[PDB]
Amino acid sequence: STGSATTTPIDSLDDAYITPVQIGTPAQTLNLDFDTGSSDLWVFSSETTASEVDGQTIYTPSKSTTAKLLSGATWSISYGDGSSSSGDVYTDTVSVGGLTVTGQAVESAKKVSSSFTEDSTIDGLLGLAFSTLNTVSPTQQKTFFDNAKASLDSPVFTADLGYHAPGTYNFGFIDTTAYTGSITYTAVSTKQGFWEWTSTGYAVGSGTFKSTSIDGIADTGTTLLYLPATVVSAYWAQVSGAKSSSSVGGYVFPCSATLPSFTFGVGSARIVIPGDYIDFGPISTGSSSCFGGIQSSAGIGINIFGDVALKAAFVVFNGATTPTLGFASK
């Protein structure tokens, strides 16, 4: 089997991407944030505290003839941005882009933190990291990808995120029309439960490539690119007026600037992030100070290849017995 679904930016900045997902019988379609940095499929629901729902579409398990309560199971998760959610668990039929999994754990939110309530465009998350990170207790549950894997034509999914435009998540096949050149594959460590890999270095604009190992995670659930302070300082030093602002929480730059590109290494290959992808717009409405798309990972404890980096590539999440990641230009 295969599946193919369009993913769409939630706003004009590409702060996140939503993908329609069918849950239950008859189908209830929710728009979920596909997150290769976590491993829970959770949804706003008829059980979510009413004051914490503001415009989201909800899953109602009592209206699904295939829903079953997963007796005694609870879940609770916290994300890198400080947001959180928790609740109980159903199993149900879940379909993405024509690919169907029966008996998928669908985690129903009883509580969500304010940032989730405040984002009416995201109805929940669909985790695509390794199932060892799944938070369901006392019986840990599998991700949608792990459950689908044996049925897929090939044990892979691909992320092709758009810049200010829709893109595609495919399951079970590699669309050779969606990228240019060849795909370069690189080793993955699953020891922390993430799609963790080592970039071979970087360049700023037209500058020379610096060969240096950068361990980080491929994380579609993070908006920006978080790299070591040395690397980030070298980037922003090429932008007149750019500075790290403690009050704003990161590097800002004059909105009148033209940003240089940023290149990262994948083995001997190179992925170029155009300068425009690094502009996240005014820090507040009408400000002439703009927020940067490359930020320091110091005090995260890991580097994060988030959407800013991933949307410059066609990315293969290869879930073979020994997982690997593939990157191509597009």
Ligand X SMILES: NCC(=O)N[C@@H]1CCOc2ccccc21
3-state DSSP: the chain helix, strand, coil percent, rounded to 5?
10, 45, 45
Contacts of 49 by beta carbon, 8 Å cutoff, 6+ apart? 110, 111, 112
43-51, 74-82, 107-115, 144-152 -> range binding ligand X (CB under 6 A): 74-82
199 has catalytic annotation: yes
Task: Compute CA distances 112 → 17, 93, 324, whole Å.
Answer: 19, 23, 33
Three-state DSSP at 27 gives coil
* Residue found by looking up tokens 């995260």 in the block: 300
4-12, 178-186, 248-256, 279-287 -> range binding ligand X (CB under 6 A): 178-186
- Whether the CB-CB separation of 135 and 40 falls below 8 Å is answered with yes
Q: Give the active site residue among 85, 131, 199, 261.
A: 199
**Beta carbon of residue 238, minimum distance to ligand X (angstroms, whole number):** 28
Toward ligand X, which CB reaches closer, 37 or 172?
37
Instruction: State how far the Cα of 79 lies from the Cα of 298, in Å rounded to an integer.
Output: 17
Size of site (CB under 6 A) for ligand X = 15
Candidate residues 15, 20, 74, 80; the one interacting with ligand X per rule CB under 6 A: 80
**Which x/- pattern over 105-134 shows residues binding ligand X (rule: CB under 6 A)?**
----------------------------x-
- Bridge partners of 112, per DSSP, are 85
**Beta carbon of residue 111, minimum distance to ligand X (angstroms, whole number):** 16
- Whether the CB-CB separation of 189 and 129 falls below 8 Å is answered with no
Examine residue 14 and tell whether it contacts ligand X (CB under 6 A).
no
35 has catalytic annotation: yes
Examine residue 38 and tell whether it contacts ligand X (CB under 6 A).
yes
- Whether the CB-CB separation of 210 and 203 falls below 8 Å is answered with yes
Annotated catalytic sites, by residue? 35, 199
- Residues making contact with ligand X (CB under 6 A): 35, 37-38, 77, 79-80, 133, 176-177, 179-181, 219, 221-222
